[PDB]
Amino acid sequence: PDPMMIRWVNNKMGSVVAVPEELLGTHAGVVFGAGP
Amino acid sequence: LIAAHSHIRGLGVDADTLEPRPSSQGLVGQEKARKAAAVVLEMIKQGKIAGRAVLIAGPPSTGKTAIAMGMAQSLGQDVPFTTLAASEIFSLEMSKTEALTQAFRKSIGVRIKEESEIMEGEVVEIQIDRSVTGGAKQGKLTIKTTDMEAIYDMGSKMIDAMTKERVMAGDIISIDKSSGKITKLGRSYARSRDYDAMGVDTKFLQCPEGELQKRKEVVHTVSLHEIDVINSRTQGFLALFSGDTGEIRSEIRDQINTKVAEWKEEGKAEIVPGVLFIDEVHMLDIECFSYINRALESDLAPIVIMASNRGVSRIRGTDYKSPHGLPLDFLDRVVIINTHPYTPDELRQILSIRAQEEEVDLTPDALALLTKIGQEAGLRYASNLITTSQLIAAKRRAKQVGVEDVQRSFKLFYDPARSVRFVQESEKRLIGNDGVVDF
Amino acid sequence: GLNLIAAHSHIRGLGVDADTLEPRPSSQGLVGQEKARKAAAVVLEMIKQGKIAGRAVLIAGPPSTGKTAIAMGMAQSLGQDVPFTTLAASEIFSLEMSKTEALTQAFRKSIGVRIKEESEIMEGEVVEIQIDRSKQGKLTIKTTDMEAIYDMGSKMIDAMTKERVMAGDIISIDKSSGKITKLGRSYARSRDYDAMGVDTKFLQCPEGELQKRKEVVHTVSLHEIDVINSRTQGFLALFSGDTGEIRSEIRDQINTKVAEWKEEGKAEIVPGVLFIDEVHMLDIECFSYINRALESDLAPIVIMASNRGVSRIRGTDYKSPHGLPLDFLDRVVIINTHPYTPDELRQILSIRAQEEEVDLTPDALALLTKIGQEAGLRYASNLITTSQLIAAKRRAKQVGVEDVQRSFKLFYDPARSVRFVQESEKRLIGNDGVVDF
Amino acid sequence: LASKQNRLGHMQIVYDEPEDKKWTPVHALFQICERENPKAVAEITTEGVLRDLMNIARVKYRELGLCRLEKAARPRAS
Amino acid sequence: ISEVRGNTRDHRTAAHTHIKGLGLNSSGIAEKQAAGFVGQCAAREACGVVVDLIKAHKMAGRGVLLAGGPGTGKTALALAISQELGTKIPFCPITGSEIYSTEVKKTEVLMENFRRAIGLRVRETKDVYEGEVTEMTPEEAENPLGGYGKTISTLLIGLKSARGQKKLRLDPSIYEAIQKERVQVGDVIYIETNTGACKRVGRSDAYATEFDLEAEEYVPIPKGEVHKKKEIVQDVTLHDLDVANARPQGGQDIISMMGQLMKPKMTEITDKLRMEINKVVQKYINQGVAELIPGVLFIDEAHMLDIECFTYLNKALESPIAPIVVLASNRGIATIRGADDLKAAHGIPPDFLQRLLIIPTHPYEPDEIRRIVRIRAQTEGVQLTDAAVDRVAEHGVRISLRYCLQLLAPASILARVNGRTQVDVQDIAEAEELFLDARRSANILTSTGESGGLHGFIS
Amino acid sequence: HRTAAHTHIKGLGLNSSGIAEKQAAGFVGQCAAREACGVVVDLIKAHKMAGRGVLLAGGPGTGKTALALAISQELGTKIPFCPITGSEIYSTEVKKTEVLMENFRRAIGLRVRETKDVYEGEVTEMTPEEAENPLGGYGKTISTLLIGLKSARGQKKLRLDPSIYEAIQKERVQVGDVIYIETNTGACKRVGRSDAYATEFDLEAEEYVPIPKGEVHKKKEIVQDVTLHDLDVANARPQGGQDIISMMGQLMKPKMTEITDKLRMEINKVVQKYINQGVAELIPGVLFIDEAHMLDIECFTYLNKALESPIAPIVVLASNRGIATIRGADDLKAAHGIPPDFLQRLLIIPTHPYEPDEIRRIVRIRAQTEGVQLTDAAVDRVAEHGVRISLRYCLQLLAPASILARVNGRTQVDVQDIAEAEELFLDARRSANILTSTGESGGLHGFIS
Numbered sequence A: 001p002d003p004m005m006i007r008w009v010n011n012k013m014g015s016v017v018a019v020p021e022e023l024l025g026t027h028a029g030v031v032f033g034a035g036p
Numbered sequence B: 001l002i003a004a005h006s007h008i009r010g011l012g013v014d015a016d017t018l019e020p021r022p023s024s025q026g027l028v029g030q031e032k033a034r035k036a037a038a039v040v041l042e043m044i045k046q047g048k049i050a051g052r053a054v055l056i057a058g059p060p061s062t063g064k065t066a067i068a069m070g071m072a073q074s075l076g077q078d079v080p081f082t083t084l085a086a087s088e089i090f091s092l093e094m095s096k097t098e099a100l101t102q103a104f105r106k107s108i109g110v111r112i113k114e115e116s117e118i119m120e121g122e123v124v125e126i127q128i129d130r131s132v133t134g135g136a137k138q139g140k141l142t143i144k145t146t147d148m149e150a151i152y153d154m155g156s157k158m159i160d161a162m163t164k165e166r167v168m169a170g171d172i173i174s175i176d177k178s179s180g181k182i183t184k185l186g187r188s189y190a191r192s193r194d195y196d197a198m199g200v201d202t203k204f205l206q207c208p209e210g211e212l213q214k215r216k217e218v219v220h221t222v223s224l225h226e227i228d229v230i231n232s233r234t235q236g237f238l239a240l241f242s243g244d245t246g247e248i249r250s251e252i253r254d255q256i257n258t259k260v261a262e263w264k265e266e267g268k269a270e271i272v273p274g275v276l277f278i279d280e281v282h283m284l285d286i287e288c289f290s291y292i293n294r295a296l297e298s299d300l301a302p303i304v305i306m307a308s309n310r311g312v313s314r315i316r317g318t319d320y321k322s323p324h325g326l327p328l329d330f331l332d333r334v335v336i337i338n339t340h341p342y343t344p345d346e347l348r349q350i351l352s353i354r355a356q357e358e359e360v361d362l363t364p365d366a367l368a369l370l371t372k373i374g375q376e377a378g379l380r381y382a383s384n385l386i387t388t389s390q391l392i393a394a395k396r397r398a399k400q401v402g403v404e405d406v407q408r409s410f411k412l413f414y415d416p417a418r419s420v421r422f423v424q425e426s427e428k429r430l431i432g433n434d435g436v437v438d439f
Numbered sequence C: 001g002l003n004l005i006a007a008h009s010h011i012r013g014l015g016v017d018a019d020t021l022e023p024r025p026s027s028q029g030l031v032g033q034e035k036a037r038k039a040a041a042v043v044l045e046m047i048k049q050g051k052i053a054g055r056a057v058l059i060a061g062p063p064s065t066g067k068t069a070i071a072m073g074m075a076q077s078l079g080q081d082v083p084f085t086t087l088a089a090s091e092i093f094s095l096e097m098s099k100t101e102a103l104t105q106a107f108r109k110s111i112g113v114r115i116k117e118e119s120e121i122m123e124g125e126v127v128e129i130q131i132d133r134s135k136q137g138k139l140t141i142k143t144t145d146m147e148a149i150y151d152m153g154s155k156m157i158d159a160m161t162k163e164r165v166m167a168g169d170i171i172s173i174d175k176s177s178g179k180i181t182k183l184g185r186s187y188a189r190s191r192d193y194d195a196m197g198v199d200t201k202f203l204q205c206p207e208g209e210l211q212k213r214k215e216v217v218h219t220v221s222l223h224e225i226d227v228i229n230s231r232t233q234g235f236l237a238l239f240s241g242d243t244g245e246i247r248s249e250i251r252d253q254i255n256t257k258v259a260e261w262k263e264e265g266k267a268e269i270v271p272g273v274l275f276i277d278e279v280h281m282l283d284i285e286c287f288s289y290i291n292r293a294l295e296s297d298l299a300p301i302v303i304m305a306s307n308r309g310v311s312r313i314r315g316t317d318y319k320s321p322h323g324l325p326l327d328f329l330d331r332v333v334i335i336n337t338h339p340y341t342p343d344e345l346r347q348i349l350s351i352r353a354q355e356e357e358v359d360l361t362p363d364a365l366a367l368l369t370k371i372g373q374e375a376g377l378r379y380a381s382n383l384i385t386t387s388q389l390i391a392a393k394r395r396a397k398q399v400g401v402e403d404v405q406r407s408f409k410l411f412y413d414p415a416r417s418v419r420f421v422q423e424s425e426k427r428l429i430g431n432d433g434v435v436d437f
Numbered sequence D: 001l002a003s004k005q006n007r008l009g010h011m012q013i014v015y016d017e018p019e020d021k022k023w024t025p026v027h028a029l030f031q032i033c034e035r036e037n038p039k040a041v042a043e044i045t046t047e048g049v050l051r052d053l054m055n056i057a058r059v060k061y062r063e064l065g066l067c068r069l070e071k072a073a074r075p076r077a078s
Numbered sequence E: 001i002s003e004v005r006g007n008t009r010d011h012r013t014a015a016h017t018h019i020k021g022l023g024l025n026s027s028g029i030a031e032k033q034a035a036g037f038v039g040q041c042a043a044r045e046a047c048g049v050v051v052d053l054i055k056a057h058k059m060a061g062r063g064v065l066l067a068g069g070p071g072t073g074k075t076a077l078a079l080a081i082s083q084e085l086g087t088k089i090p091f092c093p094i095t096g097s098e099i100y101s102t103e104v105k106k107t108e109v110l111m112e113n114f115r116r117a118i119g120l121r122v123r124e125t126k127d128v129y130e131g132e133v134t135e136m137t138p139e140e141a142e143n144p145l146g147g148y149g150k151t152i153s154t155l156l157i158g159l160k161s162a163r164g165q166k167k168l169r170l171d172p173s174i175y176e177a178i179q180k181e182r183v184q185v186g187d188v189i190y191i192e193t194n195t196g197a198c199k200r201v202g203r204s205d206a207y208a209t210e211f212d213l214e215a216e217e218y219v220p221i222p223k224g225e226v227h228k229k230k231e232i233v234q235d236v237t238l239h240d241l242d243v244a245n246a247r248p249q250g251g252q253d254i255i256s257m258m259g260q261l262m263k264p265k266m267t268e269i270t271d272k273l274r275m276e277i278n279k280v281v282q283k284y285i286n287q288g289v290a291e292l293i294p295g296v297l298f299i300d301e302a303h304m305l306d307i308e309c310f311t312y313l314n315k316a317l318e319s320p321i322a323p324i325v326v327l328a329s330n331r332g333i334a335t336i337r338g339a340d341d342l343k344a345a346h347g348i349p350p351d352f353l354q355r356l357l358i359i360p361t362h363p364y365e366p367d368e369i370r371r372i373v374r375i376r377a378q379t380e381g382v383q384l385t386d387a388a389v390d391r392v393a394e395h396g397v398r399i400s401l402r403y404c405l406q407l408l409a410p411a412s413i414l415a416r417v418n419g420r421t422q423v424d425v426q427d428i429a430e431a432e433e434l435f436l437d438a439r440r441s442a443n444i445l446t447s448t449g450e451s452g453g454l455h456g457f458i459s
Numbered sequence F: 001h002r003t004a005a006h007t008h009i010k011g012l013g014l015n016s017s018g019i020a021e022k023q024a025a026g027f028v029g030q031c032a033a034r035e036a037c038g039v040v041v042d043l044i045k046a047h048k049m050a051g052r053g054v055l056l057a058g059g060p061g062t063g064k065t066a067l068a069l070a071i072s073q074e075l076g077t078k079i080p081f082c083p084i085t086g087s088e089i090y091s092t093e094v095k096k097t098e099v100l101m102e103n104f105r106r107a108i109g110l111r112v113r114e115t116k117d118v119y120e121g122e123v124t125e126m127t128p129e130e131a132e133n134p135l136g137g138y139g140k141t142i143s144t145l146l147i148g149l150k151s152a153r154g155q156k157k158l159r160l161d162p163s164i165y166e167a168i169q170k171e172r173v174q175v176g177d178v179i180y181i182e183t184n185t186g187a188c189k190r191v192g193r194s195d196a197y198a199t200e201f202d203l204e205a206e207e208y209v210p211i212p213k214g215e216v217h218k219k220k221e222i223v224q225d226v227t228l229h230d231l232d233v234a235n236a237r238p239q240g241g242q243d244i245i246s247m248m249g250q251l252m253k254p255k256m257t258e259i260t261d262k263l264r265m266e267i268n269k270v271v272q273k274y275i276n277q278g279v280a281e282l283i284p285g286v287l288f289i290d291e292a293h294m295l296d297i298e299c300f301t302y303l304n305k306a307l308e309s310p311i312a313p314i315v316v317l318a319s320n321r322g323i324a325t326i327r328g329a330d331d332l333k334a335a336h337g338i339p340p341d342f343l344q345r346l347l348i349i350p351t352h353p354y355e356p357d358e359i360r361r362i363v364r365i366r367a368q369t370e371g372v373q374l375t376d377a378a379v380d381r382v383a384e385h386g387v388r389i390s391l392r393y394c395l396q397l398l399a400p401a402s403i404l405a406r407v408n409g410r411t412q413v414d415v416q417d418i419a420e421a422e423e424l425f426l427d428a429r430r431s432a433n434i435l436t437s438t439g440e441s442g443g444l445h446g447f448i449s
C-alpha cells in the first residue's frame, strides 16, 4: 500500500512487478496499460 | 616478453655466508660489487638502519642496472622498490624539491590489517522497491545456504550494485559487507525458458555449506604518498593516479608522521622501509643534492641506492667540476661501490646466458667470433647481433646461426666504434656546428 | 567605416596576364617587379591546381622592396574560395600552448573542407498559440505575404514552454533538427509595451515563403574540426582562444574521417596558402618541425618572407644566410627581389597619391621622387599625407614644392637620424653614461 | 549538460553495418570524436574485458582500502 | 541533405608519394630500382631486418639509429617501414621538437608517445536486440500480489528491423528504462544482454510526417539484423587506456561535467598507474583474450632531444613493454642541447649510443639522381624529354637532390601555359631563373648585399 | 625504533650554571658551540624576542644540525620548531617570499580554549516545510524543518535553516540516525543507527551506537594548538560553513596562494582580541633554515623586512661555506654565501673540527646507540679511518661490519670484519683516485668525461 513505490520481486518461478492502485491514473501506468 | 633484464632471477649469493658465486642466477661474472650489494640487501631486509646512501659507480655497460634489478628480484613483491630516474623530478606542475619528497615517501610502505565480513550462498529472491522520477530505493534479499535462511535488508548502494550485476534468482554470490562488491560465482539451477534477454549460462556450482556471516582478515599495503594524497584533499581523491597533486603543505606531513608512529605503537600498522633506486643521478643539479643530503636524517627515509657513469664532470647548475658530478659535501655521506670492466671468458658466458634466454642456438665458431666482437664493442652491440643473427638465419632457413650470419649482421649494423669513424670521414655532408654542402 | 587607407590598399590582386603569364608593368596597383611577379604567378597557378602538396617558397630581398606587397597581391588574387593565413612569426611564442602545437595550428588552418547542402528552415512571426488542453496544438505563423496554420503533437509544445514564446515573436525552426530559435520581436509590437526588458531586440517581419530551402556551400577548415572536437561545448573555444595542446589521436581520427568523406563524395578538400611573415624570427626548434610538417598529404603550399642577410639563427650561435638553417634552405625555393629604379618610384608615388586622393603638381612629384631615391619608399610615401595636410592648413588645393620641403624639414628620414644620434652622443643613453649638460 | 541524453554513442551500437556506410546525422556531422568512441562499444560487450581496463583506477583505489582507512590528517583551522 | 559532387577522386603529391615499400627479395637481398627506391642497398636490407624484427614480436625495447646527411633518405626509409608493416601495427612519427610542452614535463610526452606506439587488439562479442518498437503490450500475472493493482509477469515488445520483425518476451524490469528514456511506438532502441536496459536512439523515419512541426532527429530503420551475435576486433592503444583511467570521460556530477566542459589538460601520470596497467594487460594476455602488438616510435630529428631526455629514454627502454625506437640523426660532431660540455657524435650521448643499432646512409651516385627524377616525374604525371632529364640531373648533381625534385612543378606549369604537353629544355632553363637555389641566393646575398645601408640587407 | 643519523643526541647536556660539560647527553666536546646554543634556547624561552639572527658556521661534518636537534629537543614539544632547507622554497605556484612568510608563521604557535555547542541527539521526526516559491526558474525550495532530537534525558524538537538542512542532506540522515549538529560551523556528522533499531540481519555494515546520554544540548570546552599559518590558510581558502564558496571550495584541488599583507595584519588583530579576552596564549618559536647559502639574494632582501616585524620568530641559519658567490647576483663574493649587509644581523656561532680522541668517543657512542658491540682494537681502527678519511665516513663502516660479523658467527666486531668492509665499501677519495687512474682515456672501458 505504498504511495509511489513500484515493487519488483524475482523468485524461482518467475518475476513479477506490482504497481499500487494509486499510480494507475497517473502517467506511470502508460507502460503498465492503465494511463490517464 | 624478453627485455634486457629478463634473464636475471635475483642477486645470486649465499644465504649463510653471502659469498659471490662466479655463476649463479643470471648475474654472472663479477664478485666484489655483488657481495657488497648482498650486504646492502641484508641491511635493508633488517629494516632497522635508516638513511644511508649507496653509489654504484663504474664504467658504462658493466651491469649496474643489472645489480639493481637483482636486488629488485631478490626482495619480491613485498618491499617497495621505486625505479626513479633522475630526469623525472624536473616537473612543471610541482616544485623540484617536492618531487624528491614524494619520491622518498613513495618508498616507505605501511602495512595495515583490517577485518572484512564476507557472505556466501544462493540467492532465493530479490525484492526492489523503486520510486518514480528520482527517489530512494528499498531492498529485501532472501539468501539461503544449506543451513541458514536469512532475509536481509539493503540500502541504496547495494541495489546500485545488484542492478549493475543483474543478480537474478538462483545465483551463488559473495558480498563483502564492508567494501560492498558483488562477485557472481555461478548458478545452481538452469536457464529459464520464459525470457529472452537473460544472458550466458555460467558455471554449475552447488549450494555452499557452512555459515553466512564469515569473517576475513585482509592485509593492505599503501605507501606514505598515498596516505598524503588521501589526507591532503577533501574530495579530490584519485589524484594519486592522474598526478594532479599540486603541493602538499608541511602541516599535513607533520601530522601523518605522528599518526603513523601512533599506528606503529598500537599494533595497527607496521612500517616496511623500502628502497629508492635513482638511475643516473648525475643529471640532478645542486639544488636537488642540498635536499637529498637532509632528507636522509629522519626515521622515515629510505635506503637510497643510486648509479653513475661520469668521471670528473661539472655539476649542473654550477660552474665547477667534481668526481662523478656529485658535490663533495654530498660525497661524504655516500658510500661508493666500484664495478670493473669485464674479461672475455666472462663475456662468453654472459652472451651464452643472453642467447639461451632469447631462444637462440649457436655454433662454437660463431660464439668465438661473437666474443671477439664483444671484446671490441661491448655487450650492447653483441646482444643486438645475437637477435639479428637469429632473424637472418631465420630468413635463409637455417637451423642454427653460423659465422656467416654474424658477419652479415656485423656488415649491416655498425657498432659505435665504426660510426665514429664514419662521422670523421665524411665531415662535409654532415651538419656540424657550421654549414654543410651537397656534393 | 572600419576601413581606412593603409599601406596595402592599392594592391587589388597580382596583376598579371592569366593566359601566357606576362607581367605587364602597371596593372592592378603593382608596378615593375616583373620576374618576382612572374614567379609568384607560377606559384599561384600551382596553388589553384591544388595537386602538388607542401612546397615552400621563400621571398628574399632588401627591405622596402615589396615582399609583403606580392603576398597581399597573391591573397587578393585568389578570392574567398582558397584560404589564406597571415601569420607573423612572433605570434607563435605563446604561454598557453607550445611552439610545436601553435605552429601545427597554422598548418591546420590553411586547408579547407567544402560541402554543399540544402537548408530546410522556416522563418515566421507567431500570431496565436492554440494549445488544446484535452496532446495536440496549432501554431499560426505569418509573413509579409503568407499565413499558415501548422499542427503540433506532443513535445514541441514543451519546447515552446521552455522557450516562453509569446504572440509577436519571430521564431525559426530548422526542420532537419527541430529546435526553436527565438530571434526576437517585431516592430509591429513595439507600440504595445512601454518599458521593455533587456533581452528583446526588434526585427522586421520575415518576407516570402515560410518554407525556405536553399543550396548553400559551406567551407570550413581542418582547424575548425580540430577545435570543435576538442571538448564538449568546445565550439566557442575558437572564438575565445581557450584551447591548448590538442592530442594527436583526435587529429588522427579527423584526418581519417576527412579522407573517408573524400572517398564517399561528401566533401571536397581545398588546399590553401600559409603565409609565414618574417620567418627569421623562428628558432631552430621550429624549423625542425617545419621540415617534417611539409611531408604529409595535408600540408599547404607555404609562402614565407625574409629580410636578413648572413645573420645568426635565434636559439643557436652560428651565422647562416637569410637567418635560416641550411637543412631548411636545401628544401625551399627562393625568389629574389630587387630595388627600384626612379622611373618605377615616380609611378609608385603616383599610385599612392591617387589612392589617398591627394593631387600633386609635377614639380612636387619630381622632388618627392628624389627624396624617395635618397631615403627610401617608406619615407617618401609618408610625405604625401603630410604635404596634403600642410596644404590643408594654409588652404591650398594642389600641394607644391613648398609643402614637400616643409614636410622634409619637419620630419626626419632614417638616413639623417643616424647622423643626429652620432652627432650628439653625450646625451643619448648609449650604454653607460649620460651628461645631462 | 546534466539533462542531455547522449545518443551519438548509441549510433555506433545500432548502426554498425558495413552496408550501412557509417551513417551519421547531418546536423551532427562534425562531432566526430563524439561518434567513434571505444567506451560506447565497450559498455555493451558480453565479457567486460575492456570495461575492466577503462576504470581500473577505481578498482585499485577500492581494493587498497583507501576508503575504509581512518582519515589521519585534518586541517587545524577552518 | 548534403549534395554529393561527381568529380574525380584523385590524390595529392607529397614528397614521399612514390615510396611504396622496401622492395626486397624473398631472401632479404635488396634490388635497385624497385618500389620507388633507387639504390641504397645496405640500408634497405637493414631496414628489412628491422621490419622482420618487428613482425616477429621479438623486439622488446631495441633502438635503431639512422645516420647520414640531409637529403639522403632517412624519412624515406621510415615511411617505407611504415608502409611495409601495414596499418594494423601502430606507427607514431613524432619529432624532436614536440616533446617540449607547457603543461607537463618534457620527460612525460615521451612516455605518452611510447604508449601511443603500443597497440592492443581485443576480440569480443556483441549480443543486442535491435530495431524499431511496434508494440509495448504487458501480460497479467497468474498470481497477483495482494494489496496492489496491476501485476505484470512478462512484458512483450515487438521489434521490427529492416529485414524481419520479431516478438520478444522480457523480464518486466525493463519498465524503468522505458519510463526514464520515454520510449514509445516508433522509436528505435537496442536491448543489451548483460544487463538488459533499453536506450532509445530516436524516432524512426516512417513516422516523420504524422505531425508537421514537432521534430527531432529522424533516424532510419536499422538496415541489418534484429538479433546481432556479431564478433568485434577492437584496437586500443595503451595511451588510450592511460587517459581513460587517469581522466574519466563520462561522469554524472557537477565537477566532472565541468572537467569535460573546461579544457582537457595534459597531466603527468604516476608510475603506479602504468605498472598496474602493465600487470593487468600481461594477465589478460595469459588468459588468451588480448594480443599485444608493439609498434614504431620514429623520433625524427633526434638531435633536438636534449640530455635530460635520453636519461628518461634509458629507463623507458628498460621497461618490459616498449616499442622500437627508430631515431633519425643527421649531424656529425655536435654539441648536445642540454649539457653544453661534451661534443658527441650525432648529437647522441655516448652512454645512450651503445644501445643503438646504427644504420648508415650514403650519398647518391651521379647516375642515380636521374633515375629518381624519372620515378618522381612519372609519379606526378609530368612527362619530359631525355635532354630535359639530363639537365635536371646536372642540376641535381651540381646543386642538391631536393632542388632537382622541385624544378618539375614550375616547369610543368610553364609548359602547359606556353602551349605544350611535355617539358622541354627551354621550360627548365626558364624556370631555373624564377626559382633560385640556396647557393645563388647566398651569392647574391654576399656579393650584392655588401653591407647594411640603404639598398642592402640587415645583417 | 629506527636508528637514524641523529639518534644519540638527547639534548645539549648543560650544567645548572650554563657551562657545557663535555661527553654528556650525546655530544662529545664542542664547548663554545653548546654554551651559545644554551643561550639561544633561553632566549627562546623568555619571549623578549621579535627576530634575532643566529648563524651556525663551520665546515661540513662538524655537527651543525646536531646542535639543531639538540635545541629542538631542549625546547620541548609545546614550542613550535620549523626546520626547512634552502632548496625547499623554490616553488612553482607562489613566489618564494610567500613560502618564507608561510614558514615564519608556521613558527609561531597559539593555545586557544574553545567552547563547542553540540546538539547530540537521535533523529525522531524529520519533516521539511517548504515556503512560497514563485516563477523564478529554480522551482520550490525547502526553507524550514522540524527535526526532533531524542537524547536519554529530555528530548527537544527544533527548527532549522535551509543551510543546516543542506548540511543534513549531504550526510544522508534518515530517521533513526544519531547525529550531533555542530552550531559553530553548521556541520553535522552522522554517527550511526541507534540501537533501538538494531538487527543482526543487516547488510549495510552500519555502526550501531547507543543513545547519547546526558542533555541533548551539551556544551564542552577543549584546548587547541593552532599556529598563525593555520589561521592564514583558514581565512584564505574557506572550508567552513554551509554556503557556496565554502562548499565549492573543497571540491576543487587545493592550491598554495599568496596570502597578502592585509590578511596577515587582520589575523594579528584577531589574535590580539583573543589574548585580551584571557583565552589564548602566544608561544613564539624557531625557524631553522638549514643550508642558507642556497638562498639567493632575493630572499636575503626579504628577510630584512620579515625580521623587522613586531612579531617574528628567531631565525637559526646554517651555512657550511667559506668565501663563496651568492646565488642571486654573481658579482659579489662574501663569507658563507650570506650577503655582507644581512650578515650584521647575525650572532655568528663558530664550530670547530674534532680531535683524534673525540672521534673515538663519538664512535663508541654511535656503536652503543645502534647496537653494535666491538673490541678496542676495532675502535682504534675506525678512529684511524676517522682521522685519515672523514668523520661521517667511519661511522658508516659499523653497519656492514656488524652484518659481516653475523656472517662469520661472531657477535662482537673484530679487526677482520672492518678490514673486509673497508675493501668492499669505499669512500669518495679513493674512488676518485681509482677514477683518475683507471679512467685514462674515453672509449669502451673508460668513463664519460
Ligand SMILES: Nc1ncnc2c1ncn2[C@@H]1O[C@H](COP(=O)(O)OP(=O)(O)O)[C@@H](O)[C@H]1O
Residues within 6 Å of the ligand: B004, B005, B026, B027, B028, B029, B030, B059, B060, B061, B062, B063, B064, B065, B066, B067, B350, B379, B380
Ligand atoms: N654481470 C652481468 N650479468 C648478467 N647480465 C649482465 C651483466 N653485466 C651486464 N649485463 C647485461 O648487459 C646489459 C647492460 O647492463 P646495464 O646495467 O644496463 O649497463 P649500464 O650499467 O651501463 O646501464 C644489461 O642488459 C645486462 O643484461
Ligand SMILES: Nc1ncnc2c1ncn2[C@@H]1O[C@H](COP(=O)(O)OP(=O)(O)O)[C@@H](O)[C@H]1O
Residues within 6 Å of the ligand: C007, C008, C029, C030, C031, C032, C033, C062, C063, C064, C065, C066, C067, C068, C069, C070, C348, C351, C377
Ligand atoms: N611594385 C610595386 N608597386 C607599387 N607599390 C609597391 C610595389 N612594391 C612595393 N610597393 C609598396 O612598397 C611598400 C613596401 O613593400 P613591403 O613588402 O612592405 O616591403 P618589405 O618587404 O620591406 O616589408 C608596400 O607598402 C607596397 O605598397
Ligand SMILES: Nc1ncnc2c1ncn2[C@@H]1O[C@H](COP(=O)(O)OP(=O)(O)O)[C@@H](O)[C@H]1O
Residues within 6 Å of the ligand: E015, E016, E036, E037, E038, E039, E040, E068, E069, E070, E071, E072, E073, E074, E075, E076, E330, E372, E401, E402
Ligand atoms: N632511394 C631513394 N629513392 C627515391 N627517392 C629518394 C631516395 N632517397 C631519398 N629520396 C628523396 O629525397 C628526398 C629528400 O630525402 P629526405 O628523406 O628528405 O632525406 P632525410 O631523410 O635526410 O630528411 C625525399 O623527397 C625522397 O623522395
Ligand SMILES: Nc1ncnc2c1ncn2[C@@H]1O[C@H](COP(=O)(O)OP(=O)(O)O)[C@@H](O)[C@H]1O
Residues within 6 Å of the ligand: F005, F006, F026, F027, F028, F029, F030, F059, F060, F061, F062, F063, F064, F065, F066, F067, F320, F362, F391, F392
Ligand atoms: N659533537 C658530536 N657528537 C656526536 N656526534 C657528532 C657530533 N658532531 C657531529 N656528529 C656527527 O656528525 C654527523 C653529521 O653531523 P651534521 O650536523 O650532519 O654535519 P653538518 O654540520 O655538516 O651538517 C652526525 O651523524 C653526527 O652523529
